[PDB]
RNA sequence: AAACUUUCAACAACGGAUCUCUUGGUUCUCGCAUCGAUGAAGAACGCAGCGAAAUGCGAUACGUAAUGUGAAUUGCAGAAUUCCGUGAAUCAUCGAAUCUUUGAACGCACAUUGCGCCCCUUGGUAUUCCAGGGGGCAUGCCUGUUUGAGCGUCAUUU
RNA sequence: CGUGGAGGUCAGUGACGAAGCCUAGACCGUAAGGUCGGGUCGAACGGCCUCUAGUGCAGAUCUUGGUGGUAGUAGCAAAUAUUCAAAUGAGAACUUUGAAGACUGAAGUGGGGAAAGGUUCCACGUCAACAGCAGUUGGACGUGGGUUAGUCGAUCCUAAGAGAUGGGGAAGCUCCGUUUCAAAGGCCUGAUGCAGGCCACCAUCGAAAGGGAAUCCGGUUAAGAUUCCGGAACCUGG
RNA sequence: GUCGAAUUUGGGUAUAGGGGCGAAAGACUAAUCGAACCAUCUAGUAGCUGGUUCCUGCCGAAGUUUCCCUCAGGAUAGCAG
RNA sequence: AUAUUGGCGAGAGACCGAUAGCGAACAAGUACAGUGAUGGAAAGAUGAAAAGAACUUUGAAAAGAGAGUGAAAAAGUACGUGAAAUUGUUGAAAGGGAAGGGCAUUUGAUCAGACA
RNA sequence: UUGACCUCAAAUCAGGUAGGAGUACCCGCUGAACUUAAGCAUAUCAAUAAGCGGAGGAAAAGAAACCAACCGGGAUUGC
């Protein structure tokens, strides 16, 4: 069987502020 | 490992004699359900973890 | 790297076979089993591990001796032999 | 049976994984691993208001 | 919350109360068992009754002292007043109590009468030899009812 | 097919020893033939015959040891009764029936009397 | 006008819903009291004419004795006298036995099929060295036996 | 109005076909729904008066299973490289053999080992599935065969360390401790007791790379060899 | 960038979670670290977000009053059958 | 006299009917995952009986087309029935930048009938 | 010199017993927090869960250093 996990995480940065 | 304990080699011996298909004549028996060897193992597909 | 290059360094066992339960949970350096507690006299069992108890409890094996006691009780722990009547 | 539907160690993955927030079974390589667990709508779950 | 014109209720269901519910489905089976055990004890001790003789007694407090109910057993002064001994009365079905004290001549005499009447209505079989044939009477409380004076 | 236990019970210690070795020699031969013939079911009967001779030898030899220990208070643990551990440690019928001299007088003097209350 | 796209029907696909089934689960009720140093529960490795597994068994290894029944087992082969009988059978019953290596586990160890000591006996010209066969060697505590320790201590000889 | 099950009745329907499924075929009801014809199928089901409830789905990034469009689409583009003939075969860019052109270039794409794997090693048969193309080939599938030691390792010693005992803690699971506040045992002269004298480390576990008694050459197998065969040596115990 | 040392490294071994280890980044402690992993208490609590399954007939609103650590919530009077 | 989700032997239910009921109706604490504590499934149904398709023909074979067994192959070990999504062929119909729906009628196809 | 006594030891001394499993019910020790209070600390959950020691077919309790204030009752347990 194929486990799955948190695919990528990170690499999104932060927006506006 | 080539240098191996007798405890490990003994468990490899059992694993060797268990590696066979189902005896064919078992399918001719009255009220037979077994279709194939469901506990078959291979060195390339799963590991004994001993 | 924490991932694939790290996993390539794994060739040392932490646990080997247990002489009592035979389960590969026998820590080499602590010399204790994480499943049955060998060499401690008692077998390890916790009440929060309901499934763990179920897997190892009485009746899950052969009962080489205990399966016949109920037969002996029915007959009053008799001694001798049948009379050939 | 009072045990039925609750003999499991499942926990919710939480928001963020493109899946609903129902609890789920852990582990791997089983087929049961990752399934919906306790809820009354879940296969193999506990019925609404078990009969006493 | 508090919502309408209703009584203030007090329901103590805040512990794990569902772990200690007892529903008496066995009410009927227990009755059949008590009744069977009664029948086997009668057959074992035959022809003796299932009961011992009990004394007349006054209920203690001021809410009940107007009434007379059964008791534990005849006291030593009563057993002697009736011609017996405590050690022997116990072998012929008379219950004896060593804690009660006679302080009222009306109850004392009622119980002495009760013991005299009892001995007139029993047959004590000889220690050795063929005993007389006699039918079994199962209750002595019914044979010697207690009447309010 | 196969030896019979009730026939062996008439033979002596030496005869049953000689018969055991003969059956062991015969089984050794049949093994050498099973690797040439596709099937040789007869090997079963010889195998159970060796079981029958051994059981009758052990039964003769145990009985002699049982006559040797006749009536002496200590006898081998293998020959004692195999009841439950708890039944082997409870009081014997004699000890549990022990009654003090005081209590014995009281039971004789004041026994339970049979009586009936109808008349 | 075809192709192509879409709606519907008949046949054929993919899939296993529905219906009818059930040697399983589940709740209630009644009766009983029976594990272990006389080595348990559990584990490891083995055993069949042809078995890998579940089930059974332990070098007497799908089983040995004993008792009841009285012609099978069956997938193929075999057994054939075992059919008017101390007798078939993965039969039922079970009171006599065997029960490998282990495990509270007990000579000491044990990631070792590692290393010792004592007793009887057999072979190697052998009490001492070597091998084979059989029987033993843990710890706490109770009651007794034998051998002891101490100016703790009594009497007695000199 | 509809669903599972319960008590009563219709001496209800049915292998001469109950239930279920399909049917731009028919009728009744405003509706929820109810009824009939035909096809498919094969063993049980319904009307009415009442009882009871795990009783009605379009959704919940709902649970489990099945399946589409995207779509014969993205793609199968690192590590210089392949070609000619015969053989086997139903079938050959990919197997076998022969010829040719190239590369790793001795801190190799060579020859052996340690941890880890566990039969992948070798032979005969063999292509349904796997080798993201193919396959007659294969580390695949079926069936067998194969690992030989007084000298090589383990075994023995001790290292960091682990841990019995004697003891002291702790309600207890157990904690501290390693020669410590202990009556802690075994050898020889001689005769299994006995005359002496000598000797206090303190159990044990802990290294297939440390310390360490002793074996080299030639031949041999489909697959084993400092292990087998031939010859020549060496160490320990007696 | 550094490449004879504060060097690189195998096996053995010690330290275990409010603890370890840290030439100090809140870094590392099995792809997890401003408090690991596993089972249980546990169906933890939510004034907050989403969902809540058949038809017809008759009637049918409120976002306002007072009190509340009251302001995304309740009690209370009203409107409603 | 009282307790009993454990062990043993019995009798029952207005209970569940294979996504239900215990996790397990089956070689189920099984295969499988993790160093470890632990985690932990899917999977029942040919027929009364295998009577499990001898023999003929095309192909290298798998298989196809015939023949045959059976009450039935619209039961062929991919096996009771066999829904839907999704799909192939045949038939009918429409189609200038979506499709589907409501009221009315023309055209084609299909349905019923008073009847005396 | 010999024989006792007290206390303390050693034996592969003669015969015995204890551990481990099971744990639904039973006898104790130890012991939380989530939760409720619309916050929270006493309180609550709870003398509960987890951890530890000890038995039986039942266990535990039990023949009053009890209850009472009556015209007095009379071991224990359960409804």
Residues F3 and F44 in one domain: yes
Q: Determine the distance between C5 (CA) and H80 (C1') in angstroms.
A: 30
**Cα–Cα distance list, B3 to B12, C12, D52, E30, E35 (Å):** 14, 15, 62, 71, 77
CB F88 under 7 Å to nucleic chain K: yes
CB C14 under 7 Å to nucleic chain I: yes
The resolution, in angstroms to one decimal, equals 2.9
**Cα–Cα distance list, B29 to C69, C83, E61 (Å):** 35, 41, 85
DSSP string for C54-69: HHHSTTSS--TTTTSH
Distance, CA of D22 to chain centre: 7
Nearest of C55, C64, C9 to residue C36 by alpha carbon: C55
C69 touches chain F (CB under 8 A): yes
Which residue, chain included where needed, has tokens 């030898």?
Answer: F57
Distance in angstroms between the alpha carbons of the first and the last residue of chain C: 85
What does the block give as tokens for E38?
């009664």
Residues F65 and F84 in one domain: no
Which residue, chain included where needed, has tokens 């409890």?
Answer: C57
Residues F25 and F83 in one domain: no
DSSP C33: E
Residues F11 and F69 in one domain: yes
Residues F63 and F80 in one domain: no
Residues F34 and F49 in one domain: yes
Which residues, other chains included, contact E147 with Cβ-Cβ below 8 Å and sequence gap of 6+? none
What does the block give as tokens for F99?
């009654």
Q: Determine the distance between C5 (CA) and G137 (C1') in angstroms.
A: 56
CB E49 under 7 Å to nucleic chain K: no
A 10 A CB-CB count for C33 gives 25
Nearest nucleotide to D32, CA against C1' atoms:
J41
Domain closes at, from F73, F89, F105: F73
B13-22 CB contacts, 8 Å cutoff, 24+ apart: B15/B41, B15/B48
Residues F65 and F79 in one domain: no
Nearest of D15, D27, D23, D20 to residue D39 by alpha carbon: D23
Measured at the CA of F12, the angle between CA F11 and CA F16, to 5 degrees, comes to: 75
Task: Evaluate whether E137 touches E143 at the Cβ level (below 8 Å).
Answer: yes
Task: Evaluate whether C32 touches C15 at the Cβ level (below 8 Å).
Answer: no
Residues F68 and F79 in one domain: no
Nearest nucleotide to F5, CA against C1' atoms:
G65
For chain E, how are helix, strand and coil distributed in percent, rounded to 5?
Answer: 35, 5, 60
Nearest of A4, A7, A9, C50 to residue D35 by alpha carbon: A4
Which residues, other chains included, contact E143 with Cβ-Cβ below 8 Å and sequence gap of 6+? E49, E121, E137, F117
Cα–Cα distance, C43 to E121 (Å, whole number) = 68
- Which D residues between 10 and 39 have a beta carbon under 7 A from any strand I atom? 26, 38
A 10 A CB-CB count for C29 gives 6
A 10 A CB-CB count for E46 gives 14
A 10 A CB-CB count for C80 gives 5
C77 touches chain F (CB under 8 A): yes
Domain count, chain F: 2
Cα–Cα distance, E68 to E114 (Å, whole number) = 14
Residues F96 and F110 in one domain: yes
E50 touches chain F (CB under 8 A): no
Domain closes at, from F54, F73, F92: F73
**Where are the domains positioned within chain E?**
21-126
CATH code where residue F84 lies: 6.10.250.3450
CB C45 under 7 Å to nucleic chain K: yes
Q: Determine the distance between B48 (CA) and I55 (C1') in angstroms.
A: 64
Asked if residue A4 belongs to a known ligand binding site, the reply is no
Which residue, chain included where needed, has tokens 């026998």?
Answer: C26
Nearest nucleotide to E69, CA against C1' atoms:
K73
Which residues, other chains included, contact B37 with Cβ-Cβ below 8 Å and sequence gap of 6+? B20, B21, B22
Q: Is the peptide bond before E47 cis (omega within 30 degrees of 0)?
A: yes
Task: Evaluate whether E88 touches E76 at the Cβ level (below 8 Å).
Answer: no
Sign of CA dihedral F23, F29, F31, F34: negative
Cα–Cα distance, F91 to F78 (Å, whole number) = 22
Domain closes at, from F73, F88, F107: F73
Residues F102 and F113 in one domain: yes
Q: Containing domain of residue F93, as a range?
A: 74-119
Q: Which method, experimentally, gave rise to this model?
A: cryo-EM
**Helix orientation angle between F43-68 and F13-34, rounded to the nearest 10 degrees:** 160
DSSP string for F32-49: HHHTTSS--TTHHHHHHH
Distance from CA of E24 to the nearest CA of F (A): 36
Q: For residue C26, with 0-12 CB atoms within 10 Å meaning exposed, 13-18 middle and 19 or more buried, which class applies? A: buried
């Amino acid at each position: 069987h194929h486990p799955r996990y948190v695919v990528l995480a990170s690499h999104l940065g932060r927006m506006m502020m | 490992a080539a240098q191996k304990s007798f405890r490990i080699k003994q468990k490899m011996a059992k694993a060797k004699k268990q590696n066979r298909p189902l005896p064919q004549w078992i399918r001719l028996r009255t009220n037979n359900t077994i279709r194939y060897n469901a506990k078959r193992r291979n060195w390339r597909r799963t590991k004994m973890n001993i | 790297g924490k991932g694939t290059p790290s996993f390539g360094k794994r060739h040392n066992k932490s646990h080997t076979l247990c002489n009592r339960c035979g389960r590969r949970s026998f820590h080499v350096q602590k010399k204790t089993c994480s499943s049955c507690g060998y060499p401690a006299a008692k077998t390890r069992s916790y009440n929060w591990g309901a499934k763990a108890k179920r897997r190892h409890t009485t009746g899950t094996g052969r009962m080489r001796y205990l399966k016949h006691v109920s037969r002996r009780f029915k007959n009053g722990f008799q001694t001798g032999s049948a009379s050939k009547a | 049976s009072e045990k039925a539907g609750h003999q499991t160690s499942a926990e919710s993955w939480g928001t963020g994984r493109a899946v609903a927030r129902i609890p789920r079974v852990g582990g791997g390589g089983t087929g049961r691993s990752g399934q919906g667990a306790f809820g009354n709508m879940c296969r193999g779950g506990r019925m609404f208001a078990p009969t006493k | 919350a508090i919502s309408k014109n209703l009584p203030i209720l007090k329901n103590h269901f805040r512990k794990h109360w569902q772990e200690r519910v007892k529903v008496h489905f066995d009410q009927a089976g227990k009755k059949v068992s008590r009744r069977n055990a009664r029948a086997t004890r009668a057959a074992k001790i035959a022809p003796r009754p299932l009961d011992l003789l009990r004394p007349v007694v006054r209920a203690p407090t001021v809410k009940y002292n107007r009434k007379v109910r059964a008791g534990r057993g005849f006291t030593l002064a009563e057993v002697k007043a009736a011609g017996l001994t405590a050690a022997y009365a116990r072998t012929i079905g008379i219950a004896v109590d060593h804690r009660r004290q006679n302080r009222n001549q009306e109850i004392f005499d009622a119980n002495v009468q009760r013991l005299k009447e009892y001995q007139s209505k029993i047959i004590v079989f000889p220690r050795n030899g063929k005993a007389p044939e006699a039918e079994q009477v199962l209750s002595a409380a019914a044979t010697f009812p207690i009447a309010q004076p | 097919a196969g030896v019979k236990a009730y026939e062996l019970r008439t033979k002596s210690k030496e005869q049953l020893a000689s018969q055991l070795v003969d059956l062991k020699k015969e089984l050794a031969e049949l093994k050498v033939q099973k690797l040439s013939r596709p099937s040789l079911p007869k090997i079963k009967t010889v195998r159970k015959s060796i079981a029958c001779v051994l059981t009758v030898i052990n039964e003769q030899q145990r009985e002699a040891v049982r006559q040797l220990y006749k009536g002496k208070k200590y006898q081998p643990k293998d020959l004692r009764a195999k009841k439950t551990r708890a039944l082997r440690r409870a009081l014997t019928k004699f000890e549990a029936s022990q009654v003090t001299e005081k209590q014995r007088k009281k039971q004789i003097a004041f026994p339970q009397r049979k009586y009936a209350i109808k008349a």
